[PDB]
From TrEMBL, chain B:
<protein>
    <submittedName>
        <fullName>Alpha/beta hydrolase fold-3 domain protein</fullName>
    </submittedName>
</protein>
<dbReference type="InterPro" id="IPR013094">
    <property type="entry name" value="AB_hydrolase_3"/>
</dbReference>
<keyword id="KW-0378">Hydrolase</keyword>
<dbReference type="InterPro" id="IPR029058">
    <property type="entry name" value="AB_hydrolase_fold"/>
</dbReference>
<dbReference type="Pfam" id="PF07859">
    <property type="entry name" value="Abhydrolase_3"/>
</dbReference>
<dbReference type="InterPro" id="IPR050300">
    <property type="entry name" value="GDXG_lipolytic_enzyme"/>
</dbReference>
<comment type="similarity">
    <text>Belongs to the 'GDXG' lipolytic enzyme family.</text>
</comment>
<dbReference type="GO" id="GO:0016787">
    <property type="term" value="F:hydrolase activity"/>
</dbReference>
<feature type="domain" description="Alpha/beta hydrolase fold-3">
    <location>
        <begin position="77"/>
        <end position="285"/>
    </location>
</feature>
Amino acid sequence: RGKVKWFHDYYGYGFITDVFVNADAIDKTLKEGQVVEFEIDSTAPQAAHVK
Amino acid sequence: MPLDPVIQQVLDQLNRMPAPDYKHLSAQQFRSQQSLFPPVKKEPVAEVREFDMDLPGRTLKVRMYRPEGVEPPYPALVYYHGGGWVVGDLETHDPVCRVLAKDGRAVVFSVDYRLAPEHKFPAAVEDAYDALQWIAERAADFHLDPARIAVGGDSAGGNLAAVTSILAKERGGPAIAFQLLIYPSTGYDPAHPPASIEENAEGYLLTGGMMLWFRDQYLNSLEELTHPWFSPVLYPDLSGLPPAYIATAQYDPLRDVGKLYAEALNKAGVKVEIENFEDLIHGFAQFYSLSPGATKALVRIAEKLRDALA
C-alpha cells in the first residue's frame, strides 16, 4: 500500500510513497493523494499492477 | 556511466508521446502544462524571506535563504532560475536554492526576473544585473561580505549569471567573487554547433526543437543569435571576469556549449573549473532527492560554491 505523491497526467509517469510508476503499470491515470496497492519491481524501484 | 536509473525511467515514459508541434505551441499553452518535474525534498535552512524588489518600471519577487550555522558577514549567491527564459519561478527552484544555501554555506537570493515572450530580450538581462546591483548596494543591510558575493544559475539562469558578470565588468561593478554556472546556455557560433547540440538533440528531455522554441520566444529576431548578451561566449574580451565553476551533464545538448565557455574563459585568463556529470541529463538539479545521481551531483556543486566563497 502507498499513496501517489505525484503523477503526470499527460505523460503517464509518477512516484508513489518513493517508487516509480508509469501508466502501463495501472490496471487511465493516477492522481495525487490516492491510496493504491501494487507489487514491487526491483529489477530505482518500480511499481507493477497498480490498483 | 549510463543514464541514472531513475532518470531513465522518466525519459522512457516521456519519449513515448510524440514531440510537440513547436510551430504552433504558445507560451500560455506551455505554461498551462503540468511540469515534468515533481516537487522534491526541501532541505531545512535558518530562514526564508520573500519580498518585492522595486526597480524602475517593474517589481521583482526575491526569495532570500539564510542557512543554519553561518555567522555574519555572510557570503552570498545571487541566483537566477532556469526555464528557457519563458518558465520557472521561485517555487520551481526553491529546493535547489535550499541545497545551495545549506551545503554552500551562503545566503542565496533567488531572483524572479521577467519572462518572455511578454518581456523579450534583453528584459531578463537588465533584471539580472539590476537585481545584483540592488542587493550588492545593500550588502551592509543584509550583513553580507561585499567581497564574497557570487552570481549563479541553471540553464537560461546560467546564461543570465554569465551575462551579468560581463555587464558588471563593463560598468565597474558590483564586485562579483565567483560565477556558478549549472548546465548553462552560454551560446555558440550557429555556423559551428558543438557536437552535443546535434548528438543529444533528441531523447533527453531538453531537445533541439525545444531550444529553438525558447529562443523564438525570447529573442526579437534571429539576428540576435550572436549578440553577446544572448551568447556571452562570443563577447570579444572575457578577460577579468570572475572565476567560474561550470557543471555540464553528459546527455545534455548544452554539454559542449558549457565546455566551450570554459575554453573561452580559460583562453582569456580567467580561472575556470568544469566538471561533466557522466550519468545525468539537462535539468538534473530539479531531480534532487529523487535521483541518487542528481542528489550527489547537486551536493557536489554546492560544495564547490562553499569552497569558492570560504
